[PDB]
Amino acid sequence: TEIRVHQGDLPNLDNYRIDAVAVDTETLGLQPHRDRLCVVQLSSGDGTADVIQIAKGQKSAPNLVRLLSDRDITKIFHFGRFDLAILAHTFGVMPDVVFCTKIASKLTRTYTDRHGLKEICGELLNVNISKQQQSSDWAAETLSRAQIEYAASDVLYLHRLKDIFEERLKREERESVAKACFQFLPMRANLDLLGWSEIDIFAHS
Amino acid sequence: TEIRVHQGDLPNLDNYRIDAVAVDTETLGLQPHRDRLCVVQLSSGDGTADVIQIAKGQKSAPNLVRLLSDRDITKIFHFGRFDLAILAHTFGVMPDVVFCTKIASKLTRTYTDRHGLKEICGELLNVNISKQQQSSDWAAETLSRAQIEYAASDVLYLHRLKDIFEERLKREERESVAKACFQFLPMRANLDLLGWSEIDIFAHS
Amino acid sequence: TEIRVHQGDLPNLDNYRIDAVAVDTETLGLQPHRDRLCVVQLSSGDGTADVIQIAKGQKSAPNLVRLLSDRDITKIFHFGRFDLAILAHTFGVMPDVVFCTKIASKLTRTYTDRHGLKEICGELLNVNISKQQQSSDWAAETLSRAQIEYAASDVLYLHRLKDIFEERLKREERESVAKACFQFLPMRANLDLLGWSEIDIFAHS
Amino acid sequence: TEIRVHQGDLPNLDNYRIDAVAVDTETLGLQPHRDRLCVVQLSSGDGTADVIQIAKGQKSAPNLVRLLSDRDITKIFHFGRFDLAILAHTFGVMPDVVFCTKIASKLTRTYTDRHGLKEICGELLNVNISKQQQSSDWAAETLSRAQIEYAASDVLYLHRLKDIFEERLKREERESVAKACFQFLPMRANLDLLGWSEIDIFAHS
Amino acid sequence: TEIRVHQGDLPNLDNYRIDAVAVDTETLGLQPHRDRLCVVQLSSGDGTADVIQIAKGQKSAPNLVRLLSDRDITKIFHFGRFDLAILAHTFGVMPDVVFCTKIASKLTRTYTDRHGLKEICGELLNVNISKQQQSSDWAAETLSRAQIEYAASDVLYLHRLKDIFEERLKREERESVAKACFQFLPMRANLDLLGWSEIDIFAHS
Amino acid sequence: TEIRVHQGDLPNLDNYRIDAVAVDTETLGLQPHRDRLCVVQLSSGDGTADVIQIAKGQKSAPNLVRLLSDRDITKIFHFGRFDLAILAHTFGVMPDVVFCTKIASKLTRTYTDRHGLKEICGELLNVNISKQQQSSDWAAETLSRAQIEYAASDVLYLHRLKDIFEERLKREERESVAKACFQFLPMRANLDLLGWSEIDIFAHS
Amino acid sequence: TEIRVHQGDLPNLDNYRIDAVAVDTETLGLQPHRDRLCVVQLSSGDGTADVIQIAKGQKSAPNLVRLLSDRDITKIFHFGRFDLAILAHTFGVMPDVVFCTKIASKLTRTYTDRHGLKEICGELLNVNISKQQQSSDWAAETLSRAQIEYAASDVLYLHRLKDIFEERLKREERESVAKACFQFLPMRANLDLLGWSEIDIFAHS
Amino acid sequence: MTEIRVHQGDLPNLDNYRIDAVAVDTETLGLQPHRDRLCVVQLSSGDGTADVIQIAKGQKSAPNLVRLLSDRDITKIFHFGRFDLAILAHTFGVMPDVVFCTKIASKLTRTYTDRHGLKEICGELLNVNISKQQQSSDWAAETLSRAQIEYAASDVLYLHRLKDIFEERLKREERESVAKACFQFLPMRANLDLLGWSEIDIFAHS
Ligand SMILES: Nc1nc2c(ncn2[C@@H]2O[C@H](COP(=O)(O)O)[C@@H](O)[C@H]2O)c(=O)[nH]1
Ligand SMILES: Nc1nc2c(ncn2[C@@H]2O[C@H](COP(=O)(O)O)[C@@H](O)[C@H]2O)c(=O)[nH]1
Ligand SMILES: Nc1nc2c(ncn2[C@@H]2O[C@H](COP(=O)(O)O)[C@@H](O)[C@H]2O)c(=O)[nH]1
Ligand SMILES: Nc1nc2c(ncn2[C@@H]2O[C@H](COP(=O)(O)O)[C@@H](O)[C@H]2O)c(=O)[nH]1
Ligand SMILES: Nc1nc2c(ncn2[C@@H]2O[C@H](COP(=O)(O)O)[C@@H](O)[C@H]2O)c(=O)[nH]1
Ligand SMILES: Nc1nc2c(ncn2[C@@H]2O[C@H](COP(=O)(O)O)[C@@H](O)[C@H]2O)c(=O)[nH]1
Ligand SMILES: Nc1nc2c(ncn2[C@@H]2O[C@H](COP(=O)(O)O)[C@@H](O)[C@H]2O)c(=O)[nH]1
Ligand SMILES: Nc1nc2c(ncn2[C@@H]2O[C@H](COP(=O)(O)O)[C@@H](O)[C@H]2O)c(=O)[nH]1
Ligand SMILES: Nc1nc2c(ncn2[C@@H]2O[C@H](COP(=O)(O)O)[C@@H](O)[C@H]2O)c(=O)[nH]1
Ligand SMILES: Nc1nc2c(ncn2[C@@H]2O[C@H](COP(=O)(O)O)[C@@H](O)[C@H]2O)c(=O)[nH]1
Ligand SMILES: Nc1nc2c(ncn2[C@@H]2O[C@H](COP(=O)(O)O)[C@@H](O)[C@H]2O)c(=O)[nH]1
Ligand SMILES: Nc1nc2c(ncn2[C@@H]2O[C@H](COP(=O)(O)O)[C@@H](O)[C@H]2O)c(=O)[nH]1
Ligand SMILES: Nc1nc2c(ncn2[C@@H]2O[C@H](COP(=O)(O)O)[C@@H](O)[C@H]2O)c(=O)[nH]1
Ligand SMILES: Nc1nc2c(ncn2[C@@H]2O[C@H](COP(=O)(O)O)[C@@H](O)[C@H]2O)c(=O)[nH]1
Ligand SMILES: Nc1nc2c(ncn2[C@@H]2O[C@H](COP(=O)(O)O)[C@@H](O)[C@H]2O)c(=O)[nH]1
Ligand SMILES: Nc1nc2c(ncn2[C@@H]2O[C@H](COP(=O)(O)O)[C@@H](O)[C@H]2O)c(=O)[nH]1
Ligand SMILES: [Mg+2]
Ligand SMILES: [Mg+2]
Ligand SMILES: [Mg+2]
Ligand SMILES: [Mg+2]
Ligand SMILES: [Mg+2]
Ligand SMILES: [Mg+2]
Ligand SMILES: [Mg+2]
Ligand SMILES: [Mg+2]
Ligand SMILES: [Mg+2]
Ligand SMILES: [Mg+2]
Ligand SMILES: [Mg+2]
Ligand SMILES: [Mg+2]
Ligand SMILES: [Mg+2]
Ligand SMILES: [Mg+2]
Ligand SMILES: [Mg+2]
Ligand SMILES: [Mg+2]
């Protein structure tokens, strides 16, 4: 599978004149106010990926952010709640047309309690995802080949996953439920940035 | 406190030609598929209330449901997640223009972890709510005077509470956050009815 | 006020030619293999009670046991799971026609999570039960007046509670459910005596 | 080895003129009000199995339901609490002559705390059960061969387990205990459907 | 009423030519290696008490220690596990003829789960113990009158408790059980001093 | 009680030519990145207090900040870990000569596990602190009298508590331990601001 | 490894004219009042073992009990708290001269938290113990070869462990501590049988 | 199978430790210094060799080792030094006050994980596999096994390399002064443990 590695930004959007784009990020951790965005990965669904190294203190990624703000393009994530938070924190733009495979799994894979990307890829696609590079130094000046291949593999399958989940959402008649969850997801990420990351805002207590 | 007690439905909407109505419910418990709607309470905010006794197996309430369907009329609840579920389950209409004082409290009363109606009324209004009649037989053929007064007092204050929360939401610049939460609330209630009542659909796990 | 205090057994069944008898016990604790039966209390529901001091090592009580054996007489308990175990363990007979007000509460008072005898008397009868003497030396040769009145008060109201609960079970169409629970309750008590007291036999784990 | 796959129902009862039938189900999850019945599996104990695909929306399965309601045929389950609830919810008939290998294990295999089907088959029968297909799309129009073999294996051994457990129940003199448990189990499943699925109805609290 | 306050040690043992002496201690906390012994209290059971202030760094108290070493006098404590440890740690002598009212309560008051001194005095003696001064500066040069009265109250009643507990231990035939617990209790206190204070040495894990 | 209420800053330092100043803050909550500083309170120990209302968005307070950075003036706090973080976060200066009565309590009141300000003032000074205004709108344009008196109450006694705690630290020879804890406290507060507020940095895990 | 299997009792004591005997039991579970003694295993330390099948209802085993009652012979167990309980419950004699390798491990292997027999055998002897047969039907009429070898292996090594543990206890100067623990252990087992099996009798609460 | 010098009681001299930083670890009979004695002290200069020092029961002095511990010009490197500092100070009466802890360093830099054990850190940063099998063993044995000795040495052979990497990360994320304050308080943290506060986060609200 072809992986294109970039510094800072995509050089252009030639490969992203499409209706939906798979998005993932790597960071120094789970706390966007502390842990910087280090890598953004994209795939058009054609078996190739773009891996974009983000510099310390980088405030701009023009072509990437054009995709993120384009209401005609659905941004596909796995657990987008996190990626939306770090992307909006880093570049100041909250994507608002999204699809999340973790939310979709929670709404359709009711026969299991494991909604991780690895389990979903294994079941739906007979694809083995390795999480070994997940805990590595994503801020390294030069990413290792293992790191680059891991980062790319997290976006290579989200299109195929979205297609299968859309089928299940239609079959079980939960399309409008999923859509409302995806519509609120960017606000759920904003709530995390604002200080409510540990609070289920809809809970009784 | 004037309290108009009705059987089944409001006689007409003469007292509710208004832009926002306070709504509450009494039931036989917290599980809408098991525990029937017993009472619906309404207030226009003029210090009076309508207490509507709902019969076992009752399927319609035309005037009430017209109110719940009116996009021009904001339905105010305290923890509307529950009331929206039981009203939609009982009469078949999910209100879609709502305001919840519990969500508003969680977004503004950041200096406490107590977001109950009693606490909010004591703090914001120096008004003492008693919960003694909360655990009583709300399916009784004839409600007691104590029950009627308790049921009415849960809607008598929601207009004033909402006015104060709107002030705080404006002060701390959280108006669009609250709006997104209220927009998703009916679907959060629907998710409860559909079987996800114990699941934070947005959580990692 | 009329509390008849007996040593060992009822003198006769003259006061219990009735359809249902309220039963309760006091012990040295919650473990029937260690904690002996100390007192058995009985009421016909007429506002009087019979309090029977059971001696250490007592193996028989023919009149009481005739009541417990009599299929035409329903034995009413609050949380009979306990009283059935210690009665069967002490006298060798397991009553098989029973009504439990705690199980009835759990099947009807779905609007609360408190199903203790004190809360139920307070809510259903506006009758105030004290538990101050519950923790006392029930094996003392001479029971105190406080002890005797406490023991009597635990049976004086079970008829009235059963009457209200049977209406509720009829209103919510759960009579057959309650009956099955009461039918298994003697076996749930045997399960406790046999060594499964800490196991919900129907749980997945 | 020999698995007969059917759409909708058994074609007739020619293979089930027997004293006891092994039964199992596959579903979209553990909540019958949300998660539909997808497969019912049957075995006469002769080392063959019938695997019946249940359509979305299917309200009748007349031959299967004849078996389920025939009081002269014991239905054998592993953790029948679940299967009874989904079968009664789907087709409206609660089987009432049952044997549950999980309850029987909890009454006899007191030397272990593991009462799952895989653990019981390994110990009692030296049969290796794989649970890999347990979390799969049981609503798929075409079940995979691995799904079909998994579903069949859950009923192929229940007669042999029952025979062994009956020997242990007799040896430890717990036959009447188990019988009472099996007699209540259909009402325990009914309690689950009615809204008490999280409540041990016999517990103190 | 009569409380004799001493610096360092009793002047003599003239008041303690008796079969049993009540003993208690006050400290700066629960960790004997950090928190010094501040006060030792004694009573003969005649309704008077001796309150002995222990100085920082004090290593001997010959009269007190002669009492504690005397095999012919039973030392009565409430929860002697603690007192034994700080006494042995401070003066180098571990008493080995003891009675503990907390252990005795746990072997006899099986009808409650509260085995604190206040609860036991309330139930068995109708005596009100206040623990208000328990958290106070016990190392103060001058103990307050409330501290002095509190420290004495902790030994004034132990003989009367021991007498009641010995009757219960006899009635329930647990005298040899209790004797074995008391015999091990000095070694349990030693175990705490040696570093096993958080470990139940007899537990499986 | 003379309470001087100010907008924005002290008008001058004429009352704070002293070696130690008592400091406290009120906020909209416990998260300094979300919850703004609303009130700063100061006392010289003379039984009077200054209560300074801090405006939304206020970036400087030159007289208050002069005291905070003055290395010759010890800043006394109760649980200064919090106040230090919100003061540094708001005005940009981390005080580094501090005394915390909560840390001092944990190092000296080893005979209790309650180290809150209310409990400490009760025990050490016989002063009753009310917490009723703690959960109130500290951002209000006009503070109520009850709010103002509460805010002043949290600084009026800190000098007296520090004097007592210093006596105890000397008595138990923990002065250098206390000093090292106070020296690290500003870095502990910084760690909180940087994103480690939920982490004990010195724990094994 | 020679393993002598017997029905009911040792035929004679010819192999046990020794100072110390290794003892273990197998049962139907961990609750002596419910789960019967099925097997008793003995070793003299010579690398051979005796495995004694205990029949259901068996009330005597004279030669075995002679060994258990003999104060000149130390009975070695691993976690004898359990074996002492079930032996005394079954044959009515509590062994009173014992050594427990789990208590010894807890007093000497302070560099670990794993005190199970497998861990101890592997570390101290480089001997691999398998627990695969631990959960099997020990009441089976004919024990499997695997069961017989498992049962023997639990006593084959206890002499060698005791010798090492005694060396550690001497080295760390804990011999009198261990001896007091061993002296109390039969009463600890008695406490279990009498109803205190879930209670640390020496705990504060 | 590296060069491991085994000594009884103390280093014979300081010839191998005229350096600015020394890697330090200990083995004991357990985690409670008042009960569980110091049994082994291990040292490395970072050159791929280690000294393993058996401490006798009751041993009160270790002059050469303690000279290193109190030398303010030498940084003592530990993994989770909170523990080693407590047992060393309890045994020989000197608390080292110039230290670097790789566990604190990991908690301040490897924010992308929740696993800060030495085995994980060595695997990730150095592709070095550490075995913990000998951790639970009789460290007070008169003669240590070969496996024990190699385990003890391996716990110090890599700390210099870890410290170098962590110092780069601390610089990169601008947390050097944060780390320095943590290391300066760590000896007092270990002292608090000895004094009776081992179970208490002294900076917590409750
Ligand atoms: N602290 C912590 N961070 C994680 C964990 N899992 C992932 N991360 C962080 O969050 C990012 C998520 O990336 P992904 O999981 O898509 O590889 C990682 O680059 C890593 O920095 C975890 O379990 N703990
Ligand atoms: N917010 C949050 N993220 C987690 C948690 N556990 C794992 N993660 C991270 O969230 C991402 C998605 O996890 P997955 O859904 O693939 O298990 C991964 O980077 C994973 O390491 C958690 O408990 N909370
Ligand atoms: N089971 C249960 N039901 C409650 C509880 N609190 C409130 N409810 C139910 O919720 C309904 C509405 O609550 P309310 O508006 O009275 O606060 C009540 O009529 C009552 O049936 C509770 O704590 N437990
Ligand atoms: N869903 C849910 N409702 C609760 C819970 N606890 C209390 N309630 C009910 O929810 C309603 C609102 O609670 P409040 O916010 O007034 O405390 C009341 O009827 C209260 O009894 C809970 O844990 N879950
Ligand atoms: N240990 C313990 N025993 C109790 C408790 N409550 C009741 N008991 C025991 O169980 C008996 C039940 O009697 P009742 O609750 O009807 O008064 C009492 O006589 C007493 O011996 C309890 O909370 N703890
Ligand atoms: N079996 C059992 N009984 C309890 C428990 N807690 C309290 N009890 C006792 O059970 C009896 C019934 O309590 P009630 O139903 O009146 O709350 C009382 O004696 C009470 O003290 C418990 O957790 N388990
Ligand atoms: N959510 C969830 N569903 C399960 C789990 N295990 C089994 N199921 C559901 O229960 C059905 C029956 O389980 P089975 O008989 O295959 O063990 C399965 O088809 C599946 O839908 C589980 O762990 N979680
Ligand atoms: N109700 C319930 N079902 C469970 C739970 N855990 C597993 N199950 C499912 O229930 C079924 C019982 O199978 P077992 O675990 O007894 O072999 C399986 O489908 C299993 O996955 C649980 O905690 N509760
Ligand atoms: N840390 C702490 N120490 C206590 C507590 N209760 C009692 N103590 C200490 O233990 C000593 C025992 O005294 P007594 O409880 O007999 O008055 C007291 O002097 C006090 O130092 C407690 O709850 N926490
Ligand atoms: N170990 C321990 N001792 C306590 C605790 N609380 C009080 N104590 C001590 O135990 C004795 C009596 O406690 P009581 O049984 O009255 O609660 C007193 O010496 C008291 O200081 C505790 O939580 N743990
Ligand atoms: N969320 C929350 N905030 C608190 C709590 N206690 C105090 N605060 C906040 O912390 C500030 C500290 O004020 P103080 O505790 O000194 O009165 C308060 O003004 C309030 O905003 C609490 O328990 N929960
Ligand atoms: N950081 C933190 N502060 C708390 C917590 N609980 C209460 N507080 C607040 O911290 C302040 C000091 O608490 P105090 O020591 O006076 O109890 C008060 O404002 C109190 O409400 C907590 O769990 N964590
Ligand atoms: N219920 C249960 N029983 C056990 C367990 N482990 C051992 N047993 C029982 O305890 C007896 C003695 O254990 P063993 O000496 O073989 O380790 C066994 O024969 C078995 O009946 C367990 O984990 N759970
Ligand atoms: N009483 C008790 N026994 C246990 C527990 N866990 C395991 N056992 C059983 O106790 C015996 C000794 O366990 P070991 O010390 O070898 O781990 C084994 O038969 C084991 O299965 C437990 O938590 N409590
Ligand atoms: N009790 C206990 N002690 C440990 C544990 N891990 C390490 N130790 C002790 O701590 C010492 C130092 O650990 P090391 O530096 O070998 O990792 C060991 O020699 C051992 O005594 C543990 O998990 N539990
Ligand atoms: N204080 C403490 N030490 C531990 C704990 N768990 C493991 N240790 C020991 O602390 C040392 C460091 O562990 P590591 O950081 O390498 O996981 C090892 O000797 C390890 O065995 C714990 O929970 N607390
Ligand atoms: Mg990701
Ligand atoms: Mg990724
Ligand atoms: Mg309501
Ligand atoms: Mg209401
Ligand atoms: Mg009762
Ligand atoms: Mg009673
Ligand atoms: Mg199944
Ligand atoms: Mg199945
Ligand atoms: Mg005391
Ligand atoms: Mg005292
Ligand atoms: Mg404050
Ligand atoms: Mg304050
Ligand atoms: Mg064993
Ligand atoms: Mg064994
Ligand atoms: Mg170490
Ligand atoms: Mg080591």
mmCIF file with all atom_site columns, C-alpha atoms in Angstrom, chain A residues 57-120:
data_model
loop_
_atom_site.group_PDB
_atom_site.id
_atom_site.type_symbol
_atom_site.label_atom_id
_atom_site.label_alt_id
_atom_site.label_comp_id
_atom_site.label_asym_id
_atom_site.label_entity_id
_atom_site.label_seq_id
_atom_site.pdbx_PDB_ins_code
_atom_site.Cartn_x
_atom_site.Cartn_y
_atom_site.Cartn_z
_atom_site.occupancy
_atom_site.B_iso_or_equiv
_atom_site.pdbx_formal_charge
_atom_site.auth_seq_id
_atom_site.auth_comp_id
_atom_site.auth_asym_id
_atom_site.auth_atom_id
_atom_site.pdbx_PDB_model_num
ATOM 1  C CA . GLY A 1 57  ? 3.944   25.042 17.471 1.00 0.00 ? 57  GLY A CA 1
ATOM 2  C CA . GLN A 1 58  ? 2.516   24.654 13.964 1.00 0.00 ? 58  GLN A CA 1
ATOM 3  C CA . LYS A 1 59  ? -0.580  26.886 13.684 1.00 0.00 ? 59  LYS A CA 1
ATOM 4  C CA . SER A 1 60  ? -1.504  26.365 10.014 1.00 0.00 ? 60  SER A CA 1
ATOM 5  C CA . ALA A 1 61  ? -2.196  23.393 7.729  1.00 0.00 ? 61  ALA A CA 1
ATOM 6  C CA . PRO A 1 62  ? -4.095  25.043 4.877  1.00 0.00 ? 62  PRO A CA 1
ATOM 7  C CA . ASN A 1 63  ? -5.040  22.164 2.583  1.00 0.00 ? 63  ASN A CA 1
ATOM 8  C CA . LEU A 1 64  ? -5.817  19.774 5.438  1.00 0.00 ? 64  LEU A CA 1
ATOM 9  C CA . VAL A 1 65  ? -7.980  22.405 7.082  1.00 0.00 ? 65  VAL A CA 1
ATOM 10 C CA . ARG A 1 66  ? -9.802  23.123 3.808  1.00 0.00 ? 66  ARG A CA 1
ATOM 11 C CA . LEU A 1 67  ? -10.940 19.487 3.872  1.00 0.00 ? 67  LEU A CA 1
ATOM 12 C CA . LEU A 1 68  ? -11.906 19.739 7.533  1.00 0.00 ? 68  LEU A CA 1
ATOM 13 C CA . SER A 1 69  ? -14.169 22.753 6.957  1.00 0.00 ? 69  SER A CA 1
ATOM 14 C CA . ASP A 1 70  ? -15.714 21.536 3.667  1.00 0.00 ? 70  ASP A CA 1
ATOM 15 C CA . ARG A 1 71  ? -19.378 20.790 4.374  1.00 0.00 ? 71  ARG A CA 1
ATOM 16 C CA . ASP A 1 72  ? -19.557 18.688 1.167  1.00 0.00 ? 72  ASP A CA 1
ATOM 17 C CA . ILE A 1 73  ? -17.009 16.158 2.481  1.00 0.00 ? 73  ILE A CA 1
ATOM 18 C CA . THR A 1 74  ? -17.796 13.776 5.324  1.00 0.00 ? 74  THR A CA 1
ATOM 19 C CA . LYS A 1 75  ? -14.821 13.256 7.641  1.00 0.00 ? 75  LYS A CA 1
ATOM 20 C CA . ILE A 1 76  ? -14.729 9.617  8.826  1.00 0.00 ? 76  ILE A CA 1
ATOM 21 C CA . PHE A 1 77  ? -13.085 8.847  12.176 1.00 0.00 ? 77  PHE A CA 1
ATOM 22 C CA . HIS A 1 78  ? -12.804 6.025  14.666 1.00 0.00 ? 78  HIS A CA 1
ATOM 23 C CA . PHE A 1 79  ? -13.687 7.689  17.973 1.00 0.00 ? 79  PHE A CA 1
ATOM 24 C CA . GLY A 1 80  ? -13.775 11.117 16.358 1.00 0.00 ? 80  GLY A CA 1
ATOM 25 C CA . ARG A 1 81  ? -14.539 12.666 19.747 1.00 0.00 ? 81  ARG A CA 1
ATOM 26 C CA . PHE A 1 82  ? -10.786 12.700 20.330 1.00 0.00 ? 82  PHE A CA 1
ATOM 27 C CA . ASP A 1 83  ? -9.525  13.672 16.852 1.00 0.00 ? 83  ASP A CA 1
ATOM 28 C CA . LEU A 1 84  ? -12.067 16.491 16.546 1.00 0.00 ? 84  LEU A CA 1
ATOM 29 C CA . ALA A 1 85  ? -10.876 17.911 19.862 1.00 0.00 ? 85  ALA A CA 1
ATOM 30 C CA . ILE A 1 86  ? -7.176  17.938 19.039 1.00 0.00 ? 86  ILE A CA 1
ATOM 31 C CA . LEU A 1 87  ? -7.757  19.165 15.456 1.00 0.00 ? 87  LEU A CA 1
ATOM 32 C CA . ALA A 1 88  ? -9.996  22.037 16.557 1.00 0.00 ? 88  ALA A CA 1
ATOM 33 C CA . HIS A 1 89  ? -7.620  22.926 19.378 1.00 0.00 ? 89  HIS A CA 1
ATOM 34 C CA . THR A 1 90  ? -4.587  22.930 17.108 1.00 0.00 ? 90  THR A CA 1
ATOM 35 C CA . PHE A 1 91  ? -5.915  24.666 13.970 1.00 0.00 ? 91  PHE A CA 1
ATOM 36 C CA . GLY A 1 92  ? -9.009  26.460 15.308 1.00 0.00 ? 92  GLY A CA 1
ATOM 37 C CA . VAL A 1 93  ? -11.530 24.785 12.989 1.00 0.00 ? 93  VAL A CA 1
ATOM 38 C CA . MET A 1 94  ? -14.059 22.243 14.276 1.00 0.00 ? 94  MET A CA 1
ATOM 39 C CA . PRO A 1 95  ? -15.168 19.847 11.497 1.00 0.00 ? 95  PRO A CA 1
ATOM 40 C CA . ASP A 1 96  ? -18.942 19.528 11.526 1.00 0.00 ? 96  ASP A CA 1
ATOM 41 C CA . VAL A 1 97  ? -19.792 16.858 8.904  1.00 0.00 ? 97  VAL A CA 1
ATOM 42 C CA . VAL A 1 98  ? -18.478 13.637 10.432 1.00 0.00 ? 98  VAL A CA 1
ATOM 43 C CA . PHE A 1 99  ? -18.993 9.889  10.667 1.00 0.00 ? 99  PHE A CA 1
ATOM 44 C CA . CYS A 1 100 ? -17.648 7.937  13.672 1.00 0.00 ? 100 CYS A CA 1
ATOM 45 C CA . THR A 1 101 ? -17.119 4.178  13.413 1.00 0.00 ? 101 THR A CA 1
ATOM 46 C CA . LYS A 1 102 ? -17.038 3.805  17.214 1.00 0.00 ? 102 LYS A CA 1
ATOM 47 C CA . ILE A 1 103 ? -20.466 5.429  17.633 1.00 0.00 ? 103 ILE A CA 1
ATOM 48 C CA . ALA A 1 104 ? -21.676 3.384  14.650 1.00 0.00 ? 104 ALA A CA 1
ATOM 49 C CA . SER A 1 105 ? -20.369 0.188  16.263 1.00 0.00 ? 105 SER A CA 1
ATOM 50 C CA . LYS A 1 106 ? -22.101 1.063  19.538 1.00 0.00 ? 106 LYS A CA 1
ATOM 51 C CA . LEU A 1 107 ? -25.360 1.502  17.597 1.00 0.00 ? 107 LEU A CA 1
ATOM 52 C CA . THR A 1 108 ? -25.068 -1.696 15.505 1.00 0.00 ? 108 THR A CA 1
ATOM 53 C CA . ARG A 1 109 ? -22.678 -4.216 17.103 1.00 0.00 ? 109 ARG A CA 1
ATOM 54 C CA . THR A 1 110 ? -25.018 -4.786 20.011 1.00 0.00 ? 110 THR A CA 1
ATOM 55 C CA . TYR A 1 111 ? -23.869 -8.438 20.221 1.00 0.00 ? 111 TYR A CA 1
ATOM 56 C CA . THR A 1 112 ? -20.533 -7.372 21.720 1.00 0.00 ? 112 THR A CA 1
ATOM 57 C CA . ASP A 1 113 ? -19.130 -4.902 24.188 1.00 0.00 ? 113 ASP A CA 1
ATOM 58 C CA . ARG A 1 114 ? -15.789 -4.443 22.385 1.00 0.00 ? 114 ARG A CA 1
ATOM 59 C CA . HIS A 1 115 ? -15.922 -1.448 20.042 1.00 0.00 ? 115 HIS A CA 1
ATOM 60 C CA . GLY A 1 116 ? -12.216 -0.888 19.477 1.00 0.00 ? 116 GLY A CA 1
ATOM 61 C CA . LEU A 1 117 ? -10.837 -0.352 15.994 1.00 0.00 ? 117 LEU A CA 1
ATOM 62 C CA . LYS A 1 118 ? -8.785  -3.544 16.192 1.00 0.00 ? 118 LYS A CA 1
ATOM 63 C CA . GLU A 1 119 ? -11.799 -5.699 17.076 1.00 0.00 ? 119 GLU A CA 1
ATOM 64 C CA . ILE A 1 120 ? -13.979 -4.020 14.440 1.00 0.00 ? 120 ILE A CA 1
#
